[PDB]
Amino acid sequence: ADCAKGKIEFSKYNEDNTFTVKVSGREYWTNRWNLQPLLQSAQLTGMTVTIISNTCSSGSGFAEVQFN
Amino acid sequence: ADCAKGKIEFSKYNEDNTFTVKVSGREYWTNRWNLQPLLQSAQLTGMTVTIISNTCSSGSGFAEVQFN
Amino acid sequence: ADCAKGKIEFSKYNEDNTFTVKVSGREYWTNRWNLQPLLQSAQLTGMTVTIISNTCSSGSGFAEVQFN
Amino acid sequence: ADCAKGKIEFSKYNEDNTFTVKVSGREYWTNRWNLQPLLQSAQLTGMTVTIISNTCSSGSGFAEVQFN
Amino acid sequence: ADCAKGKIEFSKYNEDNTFTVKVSGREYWTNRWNLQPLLQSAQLTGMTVTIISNTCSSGSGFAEVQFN
Numbered sequence: 001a002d003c004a005k006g007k008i009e010f011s012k013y014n015e016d017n018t019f020t021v022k023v024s025g026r027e028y029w030t031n032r033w034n035l036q037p038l039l040q041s042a043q044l045t046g047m048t049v050t051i052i053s054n055t056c057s058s059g060s061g062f063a064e065v066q067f068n
Numbered sequence: 069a070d071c072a073k074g075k076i077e078f079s080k081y082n083e084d085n086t087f088t089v090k091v092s093g094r095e096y097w098t099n100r101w102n103l104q105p106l107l108q109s110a111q112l113t114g115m116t117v118t119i120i121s122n123t124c125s126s127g128s129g130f131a132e133v134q135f136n
Numbered sequence: 137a138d139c140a141k142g143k144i145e146f147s148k149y150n151e152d153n154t155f156t157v158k159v160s161g162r163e164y165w166t167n168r169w170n171l172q173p174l175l176q177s178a179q180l181t182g183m184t185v186t187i188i189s190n191t192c193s194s195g196s197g198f199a200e201v202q203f204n
Numbered sequence: 205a206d207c208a209k210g211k212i213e214f215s216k217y218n219e220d221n222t223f224t225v226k227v228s229g230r231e232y233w234t235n236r237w238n239l240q241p242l243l244q245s246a247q248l249t250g251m252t253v254t255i256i257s258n259t260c261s262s263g264s265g266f267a268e269v270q271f272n
Numbered sequence: 273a274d275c276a277k278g279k280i281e282f283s284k285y286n287e288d289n290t291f292t293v294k295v296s297g298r299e300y301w302t303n304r305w306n307l308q309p310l311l312q313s314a315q316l317t318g319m320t321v322t323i324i325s326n327t328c329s330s331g332s333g334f335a336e337v338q339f340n
């Protein structure tokens with residue numbers, strides 16, 4: 001499902017090396033290392049991202065994301 | 069063949085780690101990890117890309133792309 | 137704890153491959169390779185970063201950081 | 205030898221994972237993956253590059269390049 | 273010691289995978305792969321870099337650098 005669509009409010013590198021982004025008031029994290037620079041680049045340019053996952057409650061993990 | 073030439077409309081990181089880009093109204097995906105940052109950079113800067121592949125219908129894979 | 141929140145005044149690549157950033161007048165270092173490009177991008181763009189660690193005195197290590 | 209010195213006219217990711225650039229009307233390819241993002245950045249900012257190799261005819265391989 | 277401080281005049285990817293930068297009229301090289309994208313980004317944006325090493329003559333190696 002499309003869990004959230006919006007700008008990245010903040011991003012955060014976590015101690016376990018996962019990466020959290022806050023979109024549409026909800027936080028989601030991913031363990032895919034390659035998405036770190038891609039998500040930060042979207043954040044910097046103010047691009048809209050769509051967090052895609054089976055679980056959409058805040059604090060959930062995701063591994064799929066559309067840029068624009 | 070040159071399947072599509074134009075700016076990337078959107079890109080998507082897939083759960084299976086492949087990467088999809090939509091160019092000239094058609095979607096294409098690649099499994100080449102090195103293309104991910106090159107494609108996202110082309111998207112953020114509005115570079116014109118030419119998706120090259122023997123299969124050009126929307127939903128097809130590719131591994132070759134020219135950046136202008 | 138939130139050790140420092142501000143722009144990165146300088147970053148430095150160390151001989152042991154760790155990376156140091158100076159934020160709010162204090163220096164912090166991290167051994168997480170993935171953070172290097174993220175922290176440099178933040179520095180180049182003037183992003184506000186929050187260094188998160190249980191040890192916040194100048195010269196402390198960290199592995200967690202929020203980008204705003 | 206200095207094979208070509210000029211702006212990157214176009215770059216291309218090849219199916220065999222090599223990367224081609226066209227400079228001063230000639231095509232050069234490299235198998236050094238680390239060069240890909242460096243060459244694409246030079247291309248985006250319009251920086252002059254000097255392709256260095258012992259073989260300088262169009263279609264030759266290289267692994268050395270000066271930026272500016 | 274602080275060997276040189278200024279903008280990167282040019283950078284060069286070498287055949288042995290090392291990376292050279294020219295700062296304040298002197299060339300320095302490093303074998304640290306991680307420094308490549310950091311040094312190139314510094315060069316592209318005009319950041320001031322300070323090359324730190326015990327050997328400061330042109331042609332010397334380094335593995336420590338500050339980005340301002």
Ligand SMILES: CCCCO[C@@H]1O[C@H](CO)[C@@H](O[C@@H]2O[C@H](CO)[C@H](O[C@H]3O[C@H](CO)[C@H](O)[C@H](O)[C@H]3O)[C@H](O)[C@H]2O)[C@H](O)[C@H]1O
Nearest residue numbers: 069086097098099100120121122123128129130131132219
């Ligand atoms: C001699 C002719 C026999 C049949 O022709 C081949 O048909 C297949 C269709 O099944 C074609 O395969 C397709 O090739 C394209 C590239 O031309 C794509 O493959 C590339 O991209 C994928 C995904 O990124 C992989 O990286 C492959 O290694 C790439 O080559 C497409 O996914 C693939 O189905 C083939 O081109 C015809 O020659």
Ligand SMILES: CCCCO[C@@H]1O[C@H](CO)[C@@H](O[C@@H]2O[C@H](CO)[C@H](O[C@H]3O[C@H](CO)[C@H](O)[C@H](O)[C@H]3O)[C@H](O)[C@H]2O)[C@H](O)[C@H]1O
Nearest residue numbers: 015137154165166167168188189190191196197198199200
């Ligand atoms: C009397 C109480 C002692 C027990 O508490 C622990 O104390 C130590 C101090 O010696 C704390 O260790 C410090 O933890 C921070 C993060 O909170 C830093 O460690 C992180 O960063 C480094 C460098 O990048 C490494 O990546 C570590 O893996 C990270 O956790 C700091 O460097 C470290 O000294 C500890 O937090 C307390 O629980």
Ligand SMILES: CCCCO[C@@H]1O[C@H](CO)[C@@H](O[C@@H]2O[C@H](CO)[C@H](O[C@H]3O[C@H](CO)[C@H](O)[C@H](O)[C@H]3O)[C@H](O)[C@H]2O)[C@H](O)[C@H]1O
Nearest residue numbers: 205222233234235236256257258259264265266267268287
């Ligand atoms: C010494 C043997 C007699 C002739 O000298 C050598 O001739 C060969 C011609 O086949 C030259 O090989 C060419 O070398 C250049 C660099 O000068 C290119 O090789 C580089 O780039 C490729 C592709 O990226 C690889 O990374 C190589 O490792 C690099 O060295 C070119 O592709 C290659 O054909 C050789 O230089 C002469 O000494």
Ligand SMILES: OC[C@H]1O[C@H](O[C@@H]2[C@H](O)[C@@H](O)[C@H](O[C@H]3[C@H](O)[C@@H](O)[C@H](O)O[C@@H]3CO)O[C@@H]2CO)[C@H](O)[C@@H](O)[C@H]1O
Nearest residue numbers: 216218219220222223224225231232233262263264265
């Ligand atoms: O003009 C640059 C060129 O770069 C890429 O091709 C390279 C050489 O130009 C080309 O001669 C060489 O062809 C070889 C293949 O390497 C090999 O895999 C195959 O078995 O034989 C052919 C010769 O028949 O390939 C290198 C790349 O390794 C790029 O593929 C090409 O489109 C063009 O951009």
Ligand SMILES: OC[C@H]1O[C@H](O[C@@H]2[C@H](O)[C@@H](O)[C@H](O[C@H]3[C@H](O)[C@@H](O)[C@H](O)O[C@@H]3CO)O[C@@H]2CO)[C@H](O)[C@@H](O)[C@H]1O
Nearest residue numbers: 151273301302303304324325326327332333334335336
């Ligand atoms: O990236 C290349 C290289 O950088 C660092 O080494 C530098 C020089 O390459 C190296 O020659 C030099 O060696 C010095 C020692 O520092 C000094 O203690 C000794 O007495 O004399 C030699 C004289 O050559 O060291 C500098 C760094 O100060 C880095 O240390 C090295 O690992 C490597 O990455």
Ligand SMILES: OC[C@H]1O[C@H](O[C@@H]2[C@H](O)[C@@H](O)[C@H](O)O[C@@H]2CO)[C@H](O)[C@@H](O)[C@H]1O
Nearest residue numbers: 080082084086088095096097126127128
């Ligand atoms: O329309 C593009 C899609 O690309 C990816 O899927 C492809 C292919 O289209 C599909 O049939 C196959 O099952 O998986 C491929 C990836 O390995 C994405 O996964 C899709 O979401 C579309 O973007």
Ligand SMILES: OC[C@H]1O[C@H](O[C@@H]2[C@H](O)[C@@H](O)[C@H](O)O[C@@H]2CO)[C@H](O)[C@@H](O)[C@H]1O
Nearest residue numbers: 284286288290292299300301330331332
């Ligand atoms: O002037 C800097 C040079 O850096 C690289 O060479 C260094 C060093 O200068 C040289 O003496 C040694 O043999 O190799 C080093 C790299 O491992 C480049 O190879 C040179 O072309 C210069 O750029």
